[PDB]
């Protein structure tokens, strides 16, 4: 049974293949069909041109260049490439398929070369015919111009690109000064330059001059620019005769071009029906020969030594498949699999699924986890959606996003089958991400009592407004209870509502961020335990843990305790926790209001603990290394880490206030949109009122889905990513791992 590799990377095994040469080409093909072995470069010191399989790779590169020329021709002429072979090789299933024979690859190479020469000569002939046709057509257009064109040899007539006609006119004016008679008429249909196969707008230009030297100078000036000059006799009868001659020439050239293009298109259609298969087959052969290029060819023997990383659970499968290959070949060979014990950084492999793949990609974008290190995707599966939800907190927007994600999830098969754009592909891949974000946003908005900027009144409020009051009279409510779930709806639209919401959400963000950083730090502890780094536990984990606790965990505990204490009933002032924390450093031992008994002594002790832990974290590990020039590197790294950690506690606690910031802003923008868009509709009645309601709700929903669901939603999704990449993964994620990219065959699109 394959181990689950989501909590930690899959256990990796290095394996030597002593691949016999006579079956090497086949062996690689199986190792590429499994898609499980990540081969090491044993010839890393060998130059690219000095490697053993360089010539075969060069042959395959030439074949792929010829195929890339064939594709270019298939795109120049509007001929569709016949895609296929997606299910021919059963890619990703791990099942073996008989590879192309060496004779088949030789035939592919020879046919590619032969088609290269044939297509080169056919394209040359077609291009010559096309340029002749373009020249004749331009000459015909010049001849067909009205006599007024030749009214004002005695002149130079030609065709020149519009982007050059102004330059030509300016140059001719300068050459002839004021004696310029440059006429130009636009050619409606652009001409195709075969040299670039580019559509260029052109003008028929005529310049009148009498001097033979002046005429020659004008012709040279025009031809220096990409202009084609033509001879015209200026006589209507003679011009018509020349036009008829050009028409006859074009009639012959049209048939010649038709025949040549018919042959060329026949060849291209023959190629198109099989080009994809040839490309897929040659790219796989080039791929197996690059893999073998990483092997050490024992010249004295006839075996290639290939070192590859494979998941240990997959190891047995590998052997089985190799055995199958032998059973297919019928040859008797020595042990082709030999597990190896070497101190080489194994690749990081996390076994994911359609659910965990999105979050694993989210965490991998930052970096690849160290081998068998605590994976940040498993905790992000929940923590990235919920930190977003805190930043979002609305049942309406959350429900809209949940439905948007459900549209992708329920139709996941159909969307997977079709092609997707980059933005749509990203949205679909993170479809479960967005589903969780929407669900948790609904939950948080329920706790915030925020649905489309409005509040729900499910439960009896804990506040009772005065029995009677007059219109406009400032009334204050009295606490008769506590709202069971979520924020009490009593302070909806109240003057002081914002003061309570801000306090609550600041404290919520602080507590949640501290809990999420403590969880990450204990993940770091788990990493230390797994790698048996007791020195990291003693000199890195415990000191930093004490430093962060004594300050910010103490702040969190004080927040909770202050919430749990009835100050008004107890007759004690409500201490300011921010001023308590500030005085805990700037003025130790001076407490304006006593939160709890012996507060001053405890605060002094915690400050002393942090001030002792800073030296602890800074010195214990480097000194342990010294006592057992590298000690210099250890000391420098420890100093940097300690400064970073001490500053990061504060900068990370302050940063998680972005949860409150974005939640508050989302709520305020939602309420403001409600007031601007749909609240006005309630002010108008009748047909006007109904139309205003319809239009204003249309605008409100458009701005809610656009601004408050996608725009604000994207922002909150990306501030959740930083709280994970910078505040969560800064605590335990060493990173700098080797991504697992096993040698596998995949359809390669041209």
């Amino acid at each position: 049974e394959k181990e689950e590799a989501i909590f930690r990377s899959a256990e990796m095994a290095l394996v030597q293949f002593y691949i016999p040469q006579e079956i090497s080409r086949d062996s690689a093909y199986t190792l590429g069909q499994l898609g499980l072995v990540q081969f090491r470069d044993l010839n890393s010191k060998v130059r690219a041109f000095q490697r053993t399989f360089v010539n075969e790779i060069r042959r395959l590169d030439n074949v792929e260049r010829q195929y890339r020329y064939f594709y270019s021709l298939l795109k120049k002429h509007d001929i569709k490439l016949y895609e296929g072979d997606t299910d021919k090789y059963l890619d990703g299933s791990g099942e073996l398929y008989v590879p192309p024979s060496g004779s088949v690859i030789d035939d592919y190479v020879r046919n590619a070369s032969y088609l290269e020469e044939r297509l080169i000569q056919m394209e040359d002939a077609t291009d010559q015919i096309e340029v002749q046709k373009n020249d004749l057509e331009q000459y015909r257009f010049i001849l067909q111009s009205g006599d007024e064109f030749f009214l004002k040899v005695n002149y130079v007539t030609g065709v020149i690109a519009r982007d050059k006609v102004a330059t030509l006119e300016q140059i001719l004016w300068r050459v002839l000064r004021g004696n310029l008679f440059f006429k130009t008429v636009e050619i409606e249909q652009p001409v195709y330059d075969v040299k670039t196969r580019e559509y260029k707008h052109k003008n028929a230009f005529i310049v009148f001059s009498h001097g033979d030297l002046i005429i020659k100078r004008i012709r040279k000036i025009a031809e220096s620019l990409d202009a084609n000059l033509y001879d015209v006799d200026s006589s209507n009868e003679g011009r018509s005769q020349q036009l008829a001659k050009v028409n006859k020439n074009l009639s012959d050239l049209y048939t010649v071009l038709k025949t040549t293009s018919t042959t060329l298109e026949s060849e291209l259609y023959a190629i198109a029906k099989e080009l994809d298969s040839w490309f897929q087959d040659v790219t796989r052969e080039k791929a197996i020969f690059e893999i073998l290029n990483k092997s050490n060819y024992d010249t004295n023997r006839k075996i290639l030594i290939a070192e590859g990383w494979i998941p240990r659970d997959e190891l047995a499968t590998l052997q089985a498949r190799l055995g199958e290959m032998i059973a297919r070949l019928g040859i008797d060979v020595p042990s082709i699999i030999q597990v190896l014990d070497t101190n080489h950084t194994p690749p990081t492999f996390h076994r994911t699924n359609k659910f965990t793949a999105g979050f694993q990609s989210i965490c991998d974008c930052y970096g690849i986890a160290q081998y068998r290190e605590i994976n940040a995707g498993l905790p992000t599966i929940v923590t990235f959606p919920f930190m977003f939800a805190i930043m979002f907190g609305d049942m309406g927007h959350g429900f809209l996003m949940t439905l948007a994600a459900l549209s992708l999830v329920l139709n996941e098969k159909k969307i997977n089958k079709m092609k997707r754009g980059e933005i749509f592909d990203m949205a679909f891949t993170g479809r479960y991400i967005i589903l969780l974000m929407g669900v948790f946003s609904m939950y948080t908005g329920f706790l915030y009592n925020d649905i489309f900027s409005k509040t729900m009144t499910i439960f009896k409020s804990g506040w009772k407004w005065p029995d009677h009051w007059k219109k406009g009279e400032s009334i204050t409510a009295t606490s008769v209870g506590t709202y069971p779930i979520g924020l009490d709806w009593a302070w909806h639209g109240t003057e002081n509502a914002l003061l309570f919401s801000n306090s609550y959400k600041m404290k919520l963000s602080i507590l949640m961020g501290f809990i999420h950083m403590t969880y990450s730090y204990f993940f770091s502890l788990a990493n230390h335990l797994y790698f048996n780094s007791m020195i990291d536990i003693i000199g890195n984990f415990i000191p930093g843990l004490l430093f962060m606790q004594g300050i910010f965990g103490y702040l969190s505990v004080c927040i909770v305790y202050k919430w749990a204490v009835d100050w008004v009933k107890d007759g004690k002032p409500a201490p300011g926790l921010l001023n308590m924390l500030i005085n805990m450093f700037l003025s130790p031992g001076t407490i304006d209001d006593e939160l709890y008994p012996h507060q001053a002594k405890v605060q002094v002790f915690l400050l002393l603990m942090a001030l002792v832990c800073i030296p602890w974290l800074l010195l214990v590990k480097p000194l342990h290394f010294k006592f057992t020039e590298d000690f210099g590197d250890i000391m420098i790294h420890q100093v940097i880490h300690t400064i970073e950690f001490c500053l990061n506690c504060v900068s990370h606690t302050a940063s998680y206030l972005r949860l409150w910031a974005l939640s508050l802003a989302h709520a305020q923008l939602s309420s403001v949109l409600w007031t601007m868009t749909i609240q006005i509709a309630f002010g108008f009645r009748g047909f006007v009122g109904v139309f205003m309601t319809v239009a204003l709700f249309a605008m409100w929903f458009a701005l809610t889905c656009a601004v408050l669901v996608l725009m604000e939603g994207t922002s909150a999704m990306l501030h959740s990513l930083r709280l994970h990449w910078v505040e969560s993964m800064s605590k335990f994620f060493v990173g700098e791992g080797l991504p697992y990219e096993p040698f596998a065959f995949e359809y390669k699109d041209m």
Partner: protein, 69 residues
């Protein structure tokens, strides 16, 4: 069909929402007619929002039929 899909989605979202809003107005919910700045009459705003919801329902049914065909 994209226009029809967008319109029918925007119409269901608005049939449901305006029906709920009209029900809250008719029941004189505090969150909707509890403030002096809020509309003085609840049932009349409920009627207007109900008519708007009926317009959106007509749009929804028409665009759903268009999507069907």
């Amino acid at each position: 069909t994209g226009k029809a899909w967008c319109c029918t989605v925007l119409s269901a979202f608005g049939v449901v929402i305006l029906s709920v809003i009209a029900h809250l107005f008719n029941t004189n919910h505090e969150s909707f007619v509890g403030s002096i700045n809020d509309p003085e009459d609840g049932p009349a705003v409920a009627h207007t929002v109900y008519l708007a919801a009926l317009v959106y329902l007509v749009f929804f049914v028409f665009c759903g039929f268009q999507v069907y065909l």
